[PDB]
Amino acid sequence: LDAMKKAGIEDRDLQTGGIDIQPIYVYPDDKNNLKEPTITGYSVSTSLTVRVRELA
Amino acid sequence: PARIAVTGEGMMTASPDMAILNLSVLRQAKTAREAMTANNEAMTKVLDAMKKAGIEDRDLQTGGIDIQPIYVYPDDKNNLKEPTITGYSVSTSLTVRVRELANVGKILDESVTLGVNQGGDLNLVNDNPSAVINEARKRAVANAIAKAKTLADAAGVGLGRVVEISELSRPPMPMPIARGQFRTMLAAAPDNSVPIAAGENSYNVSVNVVFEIK
Amino acid sequence: PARIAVTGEGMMTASPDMAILNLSVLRQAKTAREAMTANNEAMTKVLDAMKKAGIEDRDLQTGGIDIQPIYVYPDDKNNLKEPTITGYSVSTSLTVRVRELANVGKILDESVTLGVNQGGDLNLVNDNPSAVINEARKRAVANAIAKAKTLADAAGVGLGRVVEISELSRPPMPMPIARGQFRTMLAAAPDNSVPIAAGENSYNVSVNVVFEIK
Amino acid sequence: PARIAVTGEGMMTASPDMAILNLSVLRQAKTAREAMTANNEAMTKVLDAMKKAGIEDRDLQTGGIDIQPIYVYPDDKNNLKEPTITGYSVSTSLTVRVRELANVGKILDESVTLGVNQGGDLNLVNDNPSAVINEARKRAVANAIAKAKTLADAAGVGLGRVVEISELSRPPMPMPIARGQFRTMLAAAPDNSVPIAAGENSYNVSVNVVFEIK
Amino acid sequence: PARIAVTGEGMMTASPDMAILNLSVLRQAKTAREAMTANNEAMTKVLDAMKKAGIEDRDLQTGGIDIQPIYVYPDDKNNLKEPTITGYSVSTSLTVRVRELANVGKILDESVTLGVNQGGDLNLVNDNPSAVINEARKRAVANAIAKAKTLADAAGVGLGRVVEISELSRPPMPMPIARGQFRTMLAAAPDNSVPIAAGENSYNVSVNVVFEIK
Amino acid sequence: PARIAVTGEGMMTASPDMAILNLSVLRQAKTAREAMTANNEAMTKVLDAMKKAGIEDRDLQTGGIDIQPIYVYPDDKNNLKEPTITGYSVSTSLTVRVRELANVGKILDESVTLGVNQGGDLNLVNDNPSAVINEARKRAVANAIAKAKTLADAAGVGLGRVVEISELSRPPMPMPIARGQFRTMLAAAPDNSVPIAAGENSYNVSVNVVFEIK
Amino acid sequence: LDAMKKAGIEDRDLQTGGIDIQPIYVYPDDKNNLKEPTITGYSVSTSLTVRVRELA
C-alpha cells in the first residue's frame, strides 16, 4: 500500500481485511512412502482492494 | 530319428527368513540448495540411529534422490487463478535388511518414530534362494526323467541317452502364495512331504528333456 | 547333435552420478524476427550465467527451436468470432549436464532464478552405464552356465563346448527401481550383494547359450 | 556350426540446419475458371516477393491444386435448407527452403504479411540426413561387435569372422524429442558425446550380426 | 553361408499433369423405360457439349448405368404405409480427362452449368508415372547397395556378389502429400533434388538385397 | 542360389453389358398346402408373361421356396396376450438375365406391374468376364517381368530363366467402382490408354515371379 | 498349535511361516479434523496350515 499511496491513490480509495490462512502440503508420489499428505508450512493472504478514480 | 520328449516341472517352497524395509527420508526447504543439505543432514542422522539401533553396515543402502517443487493452489481468496511455487521437497531412499526375522518389530517401530515412514509394507525374502531354486531344478529334470520312463514302457520301447535338455523359460521369481492362488500350489506340490502355507515363497522350474528311443 | 540350451540373465543396479536438466527460454515479441532475436539474446544471457555458475561447455548443449503464434480468442466485448494473431513466442531449450550431485540444488535454483521453467524433471543417470551394463551382461552369461551345469548333473551328462550364444534382445533400459518394481527387483537381486535402494537404477540383461553334451 | 548372434544398435542425434515451410496461397471467385487465375497470378506475386527477400530457385518449388465450392449455410433466413454454391476457392501450395537459422523470422513474417499461413508448421530437417544416419549405422555395427566380444570373453571362447550382417528393420526417421522421451532418449546416447537436447533430430539404426565361435 | 541383408527405400516425387473428373449425369421419370432414354438423350447432349468444349474422343469415357426407385415417404397427411414408388431415377457416370491443367476451370465450370455437379475432386494425377515410379525403383536398389557398402566396412568385410534381390511389397502407389504427411516425407526424401511441395504425388519403392560376404 | 523375386499386378476395366434381375413371387393362403399351389400358379403365370415379354429360356431360372407362418399381434382389443398364427406366405425366386442392356427398361417396368417386386436393384455384369481376367493376368505377369528387368540392371546383373511363377491369391471378383474407392483405380490404372468410370467393373491380378540371376 | 497337537494332528501335518504385518488406521469422519488417516496401531497374522488326514 506504501507503493500505492505513492503510486497515487489516497487513503480513501484503499481497503483491507479478510485474512485467509491454510496449510501447504507434500503430496504422495513415486518416492511416496508418505501416507496421504503431510504439512510443509502454511500460506497466508489478506485481500486488499484499490479503487482507481480517473479511469484513464 | 526316434525320440521321446517331455516337460518336467520342479517344486520348492519356503519361509521368509528376512525382512527388507524400504524407507524414505524427505524434509523440505524454501529453495532447493538447502533442500538437500537439510535432507542430507536429516539423513546421516537417521542412518546413524539405525547402526546404533543395532543394524550392521552390510544391511544398509541408499541413493534415489527426488526433487519436487511445492506449490499453492486456488481457493476462496487466492491468485494467478492457479498454483505457484513456494519451495521444494527432497526425499531419499534408504533400504534396510533385517536379518533374524524376529527383530523386525524392534527395527520397524523405531522407524515410525524417526519420522521416516508409515510404509515398510510386507516385503520378506529368503536370502539364500539360489540354493532352493537349484533343488527345484533337480526335481524338474529328475521329474522329466520319470515321465520319460513312464511313456516308454506304456508304448513298450526303450528309454535311451539324453539328447537335448532345454530351459528356455523365463527364470523363477519367488512366490508369495496369494489368496485365490491357493490350491494351485496344493495341487502342484510334491508327494509324500511336509505341507505348505501362505506367505511362503515358492520357486518352480520347467525344463524340457528329450531322450532317444531304444 | 546333443546340446543343452538355457537362457540366463544377471542384472546390475547403481545409484546415479549426475543430473541432466532440460531447460528452456521464454521470450516472445510482437513479430517473429525480433522474437528469435529477443530469444537469441536472453539465451546467451543465461549461458554466461551458467558457465560462470560452474559448469563446462562439454557439459551443456542446445539447439532446436519453435515459434508458436500467440493469440487473442473470443470472449466478452470480443466481437471477434474467432482468433487473430497478436505476436509470437519463440523459445528454445538447453540441456544442462550436472556432474557432481551436491551442486544440483545450487544450479537448479538458478533455473528458478533467472528464466527457464519448472524442470530438472528428476533426470538422473550414472555417467557411463556402459560399464554397469557390461557386468550385467557378464553375470548373465555366467549365470547361464550355472544353470547348464545343474541340469547336466541332474541328468547325468557332462557339458561340452558352447555351441552357441544369442543376445537378440532389444538393448537394456535403465528401468528405475520404483514402488511397482520393489518386489520384482528384489526378486532378481544377485544374492548377498548390497541390497538395492528405491530410486536406484537397474540395468538388466538376458542372454541364451547352448552347450554340447560331453 | 558355432556362433554368437547379437543385435547391435547405434545412434546419432543432430541439430536442425535448414527450416522447410509449407505455406499455401488461396484466392476466390464466383467461378472456377475465373478464380483459378486469381490464384495463378497471386502466386507469382509471392514467388517474387520471395526472391526479393532473397530465396533462391533451388530453394523454391510448388505444385498441386485444390479447387472447391464455397457454400452458403442455413440459419434464420436460410432456404432449400441445405446450403448452396456461391462460388469456388482455389489454393496452391508453395514451399520455401530456408537455410541459415537466425534468418528465418525474416522470411516468416513475410508470410503473415502476404497471407499463406497462420503460425507455420515449422518443419526443420538438416543438411544431409543420409550423413548422420550413415554414422549411427557405423556406430551400430561397432556396438554389435563390441557386444559379441563381451559375450565370448565371458563364455571362455574366441570371437571369429563375421558370417552375417543384416538390418531389414524399417529405415530410420528423423525423430525429434518430446518431454516423455525424457530419459528414454538419454539411454541410447553415446557416453560423453555432447549432452543431448530437446528439438534435436534423433536417428536410430539397428542391425544384426553373427560371428562364428572359435 | 556368409551374407549381408539390406532393404533400402527409393523415393520419387512429382507434380500433377492432368485432372480427371468423374461426372455422373442423372435425370428421372415416372417409369424405368423413359428414365433410361431420358438419360441416354441428355447424356448424348453433354458429351456433345464437351467434344465442342475441347476434349477429344480419347479423353472421354462412359458406362456404369445406375437405376433406382424414387419414393413418397409417410408424414402428417400420411395414411400411406411406409413408402410407395412415384417414379425412378437414372444416372450413368461419365469421366472427362482434362489434359493441359490450366484448362480445368474452363471445363470444370461447364461440367456444372450443364448439371452433374462434382467439382473436380482434386484428382489431378500424372499420366506416365511409370517413369517416375521406375525412377524410385532404380533409386531404392542403388541405395540399398550403398547401404551394404557402409555395413561391410564398419564390420571390416568385403561386400560380394548380389545373391538376391526382391521387391514383393505392396506395389508402388501414388500416395499424395498433405498436412499430416509433412515431416515423414521431407525427412525420407532425396537430398538436393528440388524441395518438395504439398499436392504432389509420391512414389516409394522398397526392395531387399542380399550380397555375399567375401 | 541367386534369384530376383517380384510381384506383378494386372489391370482391367469394363462396361456392364448386362443386367440380372432378382425377383420374388410371393402369394399367401390360410394353409400351406394351398400356399404354394397358389404361388406355383401365380408363378407359371408370371414366368409366361416374361417369355412373351420377349425373354429367351436360357435367360431364366428359379428355385428357392420359402414358407413363413403369418401371425396377428397384441394391441388395444386382442389376445393370447401375444401373436397367434393365421396363415402362410410363400415366396419363390426367379432371376432373369437381361441381355442387350438397353432392354432393361422394357423388362424392368413390366415387372413392377406383375406385382413381382420393387427390387431389381442395380446388378449388372459382363457375361464374358473370363476373357478379361485372362488379359489382366497377362499384364500382371508381363508387368512382373518389367520390374524384374528393371531391378537387375539397377544392380547390374543378368535376368535369367523363370524359376517360379505363383498365383496363390484369392481370384478376382469383379469390381463395381465405388465412391471413395475413386482414385485407387485412377492411381492403379495402366499408362497410355483410354480412361475409366464409375459403374465399370474392374478385374485385378497379382502374381509372383522369380527369375534366376545372370 | 498346542490345541491342535492335542486336537489330534501330528507335527507332520502342521505348517507355519508367512508373517504379515500392516498398520491399523483411524479414518476421517463427522468429528474429523483428522487429515486423511492416522495410525492407531498394527495388526499381525501368520498363516498356519493344518492337514486333516482321515476325512471324516
> Concatenated DSSP letters for F21-67?
EEEEEEEEESSSHHHHHHHHHHHHHHHHHHHHTT--STTEE---EEE
Rounded Cα–Cα distance for residues E25 and E92 (Å): 6
Helix axis angle, D32-51 relative to E104-113, nearest 10°? 160
Closest residue of C to B64, CA-based?
A: C199
CA–CA gap between residue B85 and residue B97 (Å, rounded): 37
For cell 538385397, the residue is E209
Instruction: Please name the helix (run of DSSP H) or strand (run of DSSP E) that holds residue F85, with its range, or none.
Output: strand F84-98
Rounded Cα distance between D14 and D189, Å, is 11
- The x, y and z cell numbers of residue D134, run together, are 550413415
Confirm or reject contact between C166 and chain D (CB < 8 A): yes
CB contact under 8 A, B65 and C105: no
Residue B100 and residue G9: Cα distance in Å, rounded?
29
Q: Which chains have at least 3 CB atom pairs separated by less than 8 Å from chain C?
A: A, B, D
Q: Would you list the domain boundaries of chain C?
A: 1-15+128-214, 16-127
Give the Cα separation of G8 and E146 in Å (integer). Answer: 83
Find the angle CA(F196)-CA(F197)-CA(F198) to the nearest 5 degrees.
145
Give C175→chain A minimum CA distance, Å. Answer: 14
Strand G14-15 to G49-50 pairing: antiparallel
The distance of Cα E204 from the centroid of its chain, to the nearest Å, equals 15
Q: Residue C28 forms beta bridges with which residues?
A: C89
Question: Which residues, at least 6 apart from F21, have a Cβ–Cβ distance to it below 8 Å?
Answer: F95, F96, F98, F104, F107, F108, F111, F120, F123
Residue G36 with chain A: CB contacts under 8 Å: 35-37
- Give the Cα separation of C41 and C35 in Å (integer): 10
**Chain B residues whose beta carbon lies within 8 Å of the beta carbon of residue A44:** none
Q: What is d(CA D109, CA D175) in angstroms, rounded to the nearest whole number?
A: 27
Q: How many CB atoms lie within 10 A of CB E55?
A: 19
Cell of residue C83, nine digits: 482468433
Q: B24: burial class by Cβ within 10 Å (0-12, 13-18, 19+)?
A: buried
- Expressed in Å, this structure's resolution amounts to 3.5
| CB neighbourhood size of C211 (10 A) | 26
Q: Is G15 exposed, middle or buried (0-12, 13-18, 19+ CB in 10 A)?
A: buried
Cβ pair C68, C89 in contact under 8 A:
yes
Q: Does A11 touch chain G (CB under 8 A)?
A: no
CB contact under 8 A, D191 and C85: no
Note whether A35 contacts G: Cβ–Cβ < 8 A.
yes
Residue with cell 534369384: F3
The answer to whether residues C67 and C89 touch, using CB atoms and an 8 Å cutoff, is yes
Distances (CA, A) of B133 to B144, C10, E111, E199: 16, 15, 82, 64
Q: What are the residue ranges of helices labelled H in E16-129?
A: 32-53, 104-113
Could you give the CA distance from residue F95 to residue F116 in angstroms, rounded to a whole number?
Answer: 11
Chain B contacts of A49, Cβ < 8 Å? none
How far apart CA C22 and CA D181 sit, in angstroms, is: 11
Asked if D122 has any chain E CB less than 8 Å from its own CB, the reply is no
- Residue in chain A closest to B70 (alpha carbons) equals A26
Sign of CA dihedral B108, B112, B117, B121: positive
CA distance F121 to C172: 62
Q: Which residues touch F104 (CB under 8 Å, ≥6 apart)?
A: E32, E36, E67, F19, F21, F98
What's the one-letter identity of residue E98?
Answer: V
**Residues D9, C171: contact at Cβ < 8 Å?**
yes
Note whether F197 contacts E161, CB cutoff 8 Å: no
Q: Is A37 in contact with G37 (Cβ distance < 8 A)?
A: no
| CB contacts, 8 Å: C161 with chain D | 2, 157
Using CA atoms, how far residue G23 sits from C91, E120, G26, G38, in Å, is 49, 73, 10, 9
Q: CA B74, B76, B77, B79: dihedral to nearest 10 degrees? A: 30
Instruction: Write phi, then psi, for B155 (nearest 5 degrees).
Output: -100, 0
- C79-93 per-residue burial string, b: 16 or more CB within 10 A, e: under 16: eeeeeeeeebbbbbb
List the one residue out of E176, E139, E136 whose CA is nearest residue E15. Answer: E176
The closest alpha carbon to F15, from E88, E120, E31, E66, belongs to: E66
Return d(Cα A17, Cα D4) in angstroms, integer: 79
Rounded to a whole number of angstroms, the distance from the CA of C52 to the nearest CA of chain B is 17
CB contact under 8 A, D65 and E195: no
Q: What is the CA radius of gyration of chain E?
A: 27
Strands of E53-100, DSSP E = 60-61, 66-72, 84-98
Q: What single-letter DSSP state applies at residue D171?
A: P
Q: For residues C15-32, b (16+ Cβ closer than 10 Å) or e, as one string?
A: bbebbbbbbbbebbbebb
Chain E environment of D95 (Cβ under 8 Å):
195-198
As a whole number of angstroms, the distance between CA D79 and CA D82 comes to 7
**Given the DSSP bridges, would you call strands E3-14 and D159-167 parallel, antiparallel or unpaired?**
parallel
> Measuring CA to CA, which residue among F73, F93, F209 is closest to residue F151?
F209
State the count of interchain CB pairs (< 8 A) between B and C. 139
The CB-side HSE value for B57 (13 A sphere, CA atoms) comes to 0
Rg from Cα positions in chain F: 27
Q: Is B182 exposed, middle or buried (0-12, 13-18, 19+ CB in 10 A)?
A: exposed
What is the distance, to the nearest Å, from the Cα of residue F6 to the centroid of all Cα atoms in its chain? 31
Nearest by CB to C142, which of D101, D105, D154?
D154
C-D contacts (CB, under 8 Å): 153
* Phi, psi values for residue D123, rounded to 5°: -100, 120
DSSP single-letter state for residue D172: P
CB-based contact, D125 to chain E, within 8 Å: yes
Instruction: Measure the CA–CA gap between F111 and F119, rounded to whole angstroms.
Output: 10
CA distances from F84 to E72, F34, F66, F73, F88 (A): 33, 20, 20, 7, 12
Q: How many CA atoms lie within 13 A of F185 on its CB side?
A: 26
CB contact under 8 A, B72 and A29: no
Q: Confirm or reject contact between G47 and chain B (CB < 8 A).
A: yes
Cβ–Cβ under 8 Å, residues C199 and B22? no
Residue of G12, G20, G44 best to disrupt the B interface, most CBs of B under 10 A: G20
Q: Which of B147, B151, B159 is nearest to B213 (CA)?
A: B159
Chain G contact set for A35 (CB, 8 A): 36-37, 39
C-alpha cell at F36: 404354394
In CATH, which of 3.10.20.30, 3.30.70.2970, 3.40.30.10, 3.60.110.10 is domain B16-127?
A: 3.30.70.2970
Distance CA D139, CA D172 (A): 14
CB of C194 within 8 Å of any CB in chain B? yes
Length of chain D: 214
Q: Which CATH superfamily is domain F1-15+128-214 in?
A: Protein of unknown function (DUF541), domain 1 (3.30.110.170)
Alpha helices in chain A (DSSP H): 2-7
CA-CA distance, E141 to E147, in Å (whole number)?
10
For residues D15 and C63, is the Cβ–Cβ distance under 8 A? yes
d(CA D61, CA C182): 57
User: Is B161 an 8 Å CB contact of chain C?
Assistant: yes
Distance set, CA E147 to CA C92, D133, F63, F158 (Å)? 35, 11, 65, 21
* Contacting partners of chain F (3+ CB pairs under 8 A): E
Give residue D95's identity as a one-letter amino acid code. T
Q: How far is CA B181 from CA B198, E78, G20, in A?
A: 10, 66, 17
Give the bridge partners for A21, in sequence order: A44
Residues of B in contact with C151 (CB under 8 A): 137, 141, 165, 167, 207
Q: Is A22 on the interface with B (CB under 8 A)?
A: yes
Closest CB to D191: pick one of C34, C66, C128: C128
- Going by C-alpha positions, the residue among B96, E61, E149, D153 that lies closest to residue C197 is B96
DSSP D22-82: EEEEEEE-SSHHHHHHHHHHHHHHHHHHHHTTT--STTEEEEEEEEEEEEE--SSS--SSS
Question: What 3-state class would DSSP assign to E23?
Answer: strand
Radius of gyration (C-alpha) of chain A in whole angstroms: 19
Q: Are F109 and E32 within 8 A, CB to CB? A: yes
Could you write out the three-class secondary structure of chain C? Answer: CCEEEEEEEEEEEECCCEEEEEEECCEECCCCHHHHHHHHHHHHHHHHHHHHCCCCCCCEEEEEEEEEEEEECCCCCCCCCCCEEEEEEEEEEEEEEEECHHHHHHHHHHHHHHCCCCCCCCCEECCCHHHHHHHHHHHHHHHHHHHHHHHHHHHCCCEEEEEEEEECCCCCCCEECCCCCHHHHHHHCCCCCCCCCCCCEEEEEEEEEEEEEC
* Technique behind the model: X-ray
Contact in structure between A47 and A53 (CB atoms under 8 Å):
no
Q: Does E70 touch chain F (CB under 8 A)?
A: no
Residue F138 to residue F27: CA distance in whole angstroms? 50
- B196 by Cβ neighbours in 10 Å (0-12 / 13-18 / 19+) ranks as buried
User: Looking at chain G, after which residues does the C atom sit over 2.5 Å from the next written N, breaking the chain?
Assistant: none
